[PDB]
Design a binder for this molecule. Structure first.
Ligand code: HEC
Ligand code: HEC
Length: 227
C-alpha cells in the first residue's frame, strides 16, 4: 500500500479546476441541499465518508476518497462487469442516498470527480492507499440484537436518537444522521450489510468487536426504505 495524505487546501490552484474542486467538496458535504433532485433521504456523502477540516473522505477505515480515482475502472459483482468511478458514485446516490444517479457528464458529478482527484494527487495509479474502504468486521456467532439494544441506549442514542432518526442542526442538515427509518440509507446500501455496518461502527463510533457486532445487529433490525 501507499500512505494516506491529505493535500493542503491553501495550495489549491487558481482557475477552473480549483473552483470545481471547491464545488465538489460542497456537493459531497451538503448533498441533500445542493442536489435535491438526486437525493431521496437526509444523508450527505460525508455521513459515511467523513473528513476533518471541512474535507470529505479523508479518514482511514471510513472509506476515504484519497486514492480512489486510481482504482477505477474495476469489476463490480453487483453489475457483472467493469464500472467507472462515475458509475460507482451513481450507485451510492441510488442506494446510500435513496435517490437517483446523476448523468455521467453532469457538472456536479464532474466537480465531485475533480475533488476526489485532488484528494488523490500524488497517488500512483493502481496503488492501494492505507485505510481505504470500510474494513468488514465479522464474528463467528449470531449478532445479539437484545444486547445491541442495550449498547445502543448506552453508547449511540444520545446522538442518533431513541428512534434512530438523528439530530438536525440549526441549518436543517443532519448533525447526527438517521440510522433507520425513512430518511436513512435504503436496503440496497452497503451499510445495510451486517459486517459492513459492524466495521463502520467499530472504526468510527471504545467499542469492542463483540459490542460493534451486536449493536450493528440491533441497528439492522429496523425498517428503512426499500431499494
Ligand atoms: C450510508 C453510508 C454511505 C453514504 C451516505 C455514502 N456512501 Fe459511498 N460508500 C459506502 C460504503 C459502505 C462503501 C464501501 C467501502 C468499501 O469499499 O469498503 C462506499 C464506497 C464508495 C466509493 C468507492 C470507494 C472505494 O474505495 O472503492 C465511492 C466513490 C463512494 N462511496 C462515493 C459516495 C458519494 C459520492 C456519496 C454521496 C453521494 C456516498 N458515497 C454516500 C457508504 C456510503
Ligand atoms: C458524538 C455523537 C455520535 C455517537 C455517540 C455515535 N455516532 Fe454514529 N455518527 C455520528 C456522526 C456525526 C456521523 C456522520 C459521520 C461522521 O462525521 O463521523 C455518524 C455516522 C454513523 C453511521 C453512518 C451514517 C448513517 O446515517 O447510517 C452509522 C451506521 C452510525 N453512525 C452508527 C452509530 C452507532 C451504532 C453508535 C453507537 C455505537 C454511534 N453511531 C455513536 C455521531 C455519533
Amino acid at each position: 500500500t501507499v500512505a494516506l495524505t491529505v493535500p493542503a487546501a491553501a495550495l489549491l490552484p487558481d482557475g477552473a479546476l480549483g473552483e470545481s474542486i471547491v464545488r465538489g467538496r460542497r456537493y459531497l458535504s451538503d448533498t441533500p441541499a445542493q442536489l435535491p433532485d438526486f437525493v431521496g433521504n437526509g444523508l450527505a456523502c460525508r455521513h459515511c465518508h467523513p473528513g476533518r477540516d471541512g474535507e470529505v473522505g479523508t479518514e482511514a477505515n471510513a472509506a476515504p476518497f484519497v486514492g480512489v480515482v486510481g482504482r477505477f475502472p474495476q469489476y463490480s459483482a453487483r453489475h457483472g462487469r467493469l464500472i467507472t468511478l462515475e458509475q460507482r458514485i451513481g450507485d451510492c446516490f441510488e442506494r446510500s442516498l435513496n435517490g437517483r444517479a446523476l448523468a455521467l457528464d453532469h457538472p456536479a458529478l464532474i466537480d465531485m470527480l475533480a475533488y476526489m482527484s485532488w484528494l488523490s494527487q500524488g497517488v500512483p495509479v493502481g496503488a492501494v492507499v492505507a485505510g481505504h474502504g470500510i474494513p468488514t468486521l465479522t464474528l463467528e456467532r449470531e449478532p445479539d440484537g437484545v444486547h445491541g439494544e442495550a449498547l445502543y441506549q448506552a453508547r449511540c442514542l444520545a446522538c442518533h436518537g431513541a428512534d434512530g432518526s438523528g439530530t438536525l442542526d440549526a441549518d436543517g442538515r443532519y448533525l447526527f444522521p438517521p440510522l433507520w427509518g425513512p430518511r436513512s440509507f435504503n436496503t440496497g446500501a452497503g451499510m445495510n450489510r451486517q459486517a459492513t455496518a459492524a466495521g463502520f461502527i467499530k472504526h468510527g463510533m471504545s467499542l469492542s468487536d463483540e459490542e460493534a457486532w451486536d449493536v450493528a445487529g440491533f441497528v439492522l433490525t429496523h425498517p428503512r426504505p426499500l431499494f
